[PDB]
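Sequence in, structure out.
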Amino acid sequence: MTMHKALTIAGSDSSGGAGIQADLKTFQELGVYGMSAITAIVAQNTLGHKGVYPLPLEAIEAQLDTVLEDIGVDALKTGMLATAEIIELVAEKIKEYNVKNVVVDPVMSLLHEEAAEALREELIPLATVVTPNLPEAEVLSGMRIIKTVEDMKEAAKKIHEMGAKYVLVKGVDVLFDGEEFEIFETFSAAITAELAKGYSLKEAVKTAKEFITE
């Protein structure tokens, strides 16, 4: 349908239920050309194997440079980023290529804690929107527990002050734009596709909600 392009920087899901595979399906359904940069193999943690296999940084950079130099994107989403080092690389590339439409889906030890810090300090300040669920919002905002809508608004406030232009806390859902709160009754991939087509964040969120329910 459209000539617009979106990139997902996230983990690979062999079942196709989530990950870059589901992101690319969503892009296609919404008439955007989809491209992917795989940061990690994401499986279940079992007696036989770990649940997360981060890819070499040079392999991630090869993917990102291929897409950003040679093809170009109108919007991108981030999902599983795995390590602080990968997060920092991704933030660097967003700045290097001046990518203005960025959807951060915060899919989430000294490893995990350093990774959370890199997300808060390096990537969140570049986000058009951050879409945490409640545990993710607690980690990102530092809220002890998010138990009420007022708590959700506070966490959205906090994340906006960390640099995110919009924040959508998934509960009701709470959208905050730094001045007003909007309270509503993959999702992040759909938001990305709508932004790629030229839509405002608020229109992208409304259209992504309707797409998910259908």
